Design a protein around this ligand. Structure first.
Ligand SMILES: [Mg+2]
Ligand SMILES: [Mg+2]
Ligand SMILES: [Mg+2]
Ligand SMILES: [Mg+2]
Ligand SMILES: [Mg+2]
Lengths: 243, 243, 243, 243, 243
């Protein structure tokens, strides 16, 4: 039933400040310039509408930095990761957490008379340009399969009706939050990735809390870790890494 | 229903004593001055009513030191964490645990006729100056969503009755313990943070054990790790880190 | 009931790029040659039909490279592992995950009249030459033993009818995905290893999602981590490891 | 209902033998003497009945050495832990596990007519001199709160009845084992620490197994890790650390 | 009911091949001689009937090598571990897993008229010479205590009738597999250790899978990690560690 879009990598890293500070100044500046040159490649790709990327600083110890990358193939995600790891800066960007998934759409008007992969209204959700909002939030999730709270043993109808209320709660946040749903069954450790974008970080809390009182989330939601962060403008990269 | 206040970062670190002891004395002393100068900034900010902080040493191996930081924005939490990590001392303050949340209030008298964010008796709770008590305790919590113990599937009335008892247990500790509840749904791994402040650390055990016999806690509480600590005022920092 | 074929090791590693970069160029190049010489022995084994192997790069941080090795004995698995670990490159290939299992068949026409280990259509499944597809997916699984969802408490009849739906789902993916099932009860921490091979990675998500709606998976599936990757032919090894 | 006694730290460490062996011999000897000098302080404290301590070597890889420390305040535990960490030997005593708790008594003859914190028969239990038995066992515990097995939702009277059999099983081991119960609700990750002391390590297994058939343990016990050790007389410290 | 025999340490290590390769050749040779001289002491002890041991290489990343040691006291396990760790080789044998337990016998013909500890046929099993088989398999287990599957809430007769089936599955592997059961209630993290010895590793998978269909295992079995290895003859040690 779902339409699949761009592959997605969330690549979180922790900064080894102690090691970075021992690198001579000239090698640090070179490393920053090298990394900025890489991101410039990403920006050209995003300008050509052949992928997208978001770079946020993450608050707390689960990570310091998120690179969220959308590309048309799994190979390209691998290529990006590898290029990143071969930069000098990446030596100081230790592993923290990662997620591999694919942009997934279930909600669209299906007529049968068109290839939806060629319809503009659909493509712009399949192949999204990521929002450049002040804040981001990521978490992965499963649908529960435990006792009488087993999502996958429900009827289609029952699932549809449960998902109605979920949609209704989302509608309350129109123009306040945007959500990128990626599917990861068969690709990583949970079933979906949820990435929220907002200019107001409080809306992540309002929205995710309000959702939790809908039956689909209360009885069927299993959630992983939540990562929240602030946009890192590429103009601020040098000062962020300045020591 | 809740009013949201300052953002909160609990940053817990373990001290790499062995490495620290290798750093030349003059450089340890310079690192301590550099750290004190940073906390001195935090103190000015608190004095200005533009945030608050608490610094405690933590007993046992889960951590050695806690920095608890309240600020108006998530950006300022990022800035503080980054500033801290760029200090020399922070090289020896290894990751242990962290929590990101926002001061949250549900109980206030709501009339309609005023903006509660401008009422003094509400503002002083949203934007608290943290207690300077001998001891602190932190733990995170969820409300349970399992089987027949699913908080989010209850009625509003059933939750309100359950929370009654909880409120009444708390009243018993008026003047003995203060509790700062932060909400982290959508922001970190559990649903709430709970920070307790008392001049008698036994009060933490008394209070949390007593609460556990209230139905809300017994049936619906899910608890993370508990961290307990002793105040580390800045005048004691030099002696604590001295080797 | 099951026929057992070649033992299997899945050996996943993460690359210590920082340390590798410090190794002088001439020694990195000699390490890559040594490693290729090793894989060339594996290829000789496989062309003699005395085992098989695959080498994939893995996307994300759970691992960077997978060596999947099939051999006639557990000893040979130990000798391969040991010989890999004594290469120079392996010093930079840090532990990430591993799995030990044996190729297991339940599906064959059993007539009584032949030794199935001698039948060519059985042998080619016990002792498989692994697919050289663009992509791979690995996950382990258990059959659930919880409450009223206890696979092992069912009747033989109930298990058979359960597994018939599961086989029907698999049939939909004929010629799009091939699946190697290894058994690991008594050998590793889960009960089966599942390795999927496809030239379209989306087919992993499609297949594994679709299966999750079969009662057998919905009620009785317990899954470990999912690792996805892209093929690493030996001709691409020098470029992949180049710095 | 409970009376509270001394605070308790269990500090488990693993020995970094490889590093220890690199340290110059005259520095190892000084480090041993420095450590013994610390323990001499602990011994003066214990002689004055203002704390107690136990030092055991722990079998297996969960730890190598346990320092169990009882002191009148939480601050004193922090001071002891900090002094220990500032010794040279502690550089080689890596983190393994720790537990923070308070000696707790439930069972005592309550007259109302006296302050039981001043009664000799109670004081010797609140403020125990730890036994110098050949062996020790430590484990933490919670009382279950799951489904129909919820300790905290029982009546007082149901709890009292359950604890009766538990008391009866203990009475069987009079003279053979002694048990220090410490409460950690609000202080660490489980609800109680259990420390058993015996001259016969088999009695740990006999006792803990027999307890497990009591309904209170079978239905409501949840156990952490178990750590068993042999007494390290201070006269054997130099030989133990000799390399 | 149970008779206890020798104490048992399972000590698993991972080899630090990178570090070992940097040690000069002469120091490696000396370290191998030193280790071989240690195991010669163990061989003498076994020959005097005062203990037993087994040394196996473990396949996969959970470990590389297992030393399984039986001695009459826990103190002797401590001594052996300490002596091992003080060898040069052990600096390169990093922590992986460990288990501390005691050989435990429930099944024996009890007359009343003899001290069973003095009976040949019982002593043979309390104080066993470990099998010198081609392969070994280790895992720990608990008996479940969850909901309606609570082993310790059954009657003695219910347990008896459940264990009967278990015994009958084992009898099917007479002469194929031998099993050393050690009890660890009160001593380590699970309730029993299960060590299996066979000259055909496939028999581990057959036996353990067949058991899982017995009600006692299906409903009451909780398993830890499974480690499988190949015998390491002392004559092969030099080759194995040769770099
Ligand atoms: Mg890295
Ligand atoms: Mg750091
Ligand atoms: Mg290695
Ligand atoms: Mg330390
Ligand atoms: Mg070691």
């Amino acid at each position: 039933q779902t339409l699949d879009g761009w592959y997605c990598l969330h690549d979180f890293r922790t900064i080894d400040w102690s090691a970075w500070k021992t690198l001579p100044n000239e090698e640090r500046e070179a490393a920053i310039s090298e990394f900025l040159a890489l991101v410039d490649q990403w920006e050209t790709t995003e300008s050509e509408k052949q992928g997208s990327h978001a770079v946020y600083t993450i608050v707390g110890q689960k990570a310091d930095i998120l690179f969220m990358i959308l590309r048309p193939t799994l190979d390209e995600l691998h290529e990006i990761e590898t290029a990143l790891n071969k930069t000098k800066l990446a030596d100081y960007l230790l592993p923290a957490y990662s997620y591999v998934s694919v942009v997934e759409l279930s909600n669209y008007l299906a007529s049968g008379s068109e290839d939806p992969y060629q319809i503009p209204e659909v493509r712009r959700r399949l192949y999204p340009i990521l929002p450049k909002t002040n804040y981001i939030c990521f978490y992965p999730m499963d649908k529960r399969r435990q006792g009488n709270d087993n999502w996958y043993m429900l009827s289609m109808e029952q699932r549809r009706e449960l998902m109605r209320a979920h949609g209704m709660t989302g509608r309350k946040y129109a123009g306040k939050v945007t959500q990128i749903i990626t599917g990861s069954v068969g690709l990583d450790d949970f079933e979906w990735g949820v990435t929220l974008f907002s200019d107001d970080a409080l809306q992540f809390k309002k929205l995710v809390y309000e959702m939790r009182f809908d039956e689909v989330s209360a009885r069927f939601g299993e959630f992983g870790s939540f990562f929240v962060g602030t946009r890192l403008p590429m103009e601020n990269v040098s000062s962020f890494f300045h020591v």
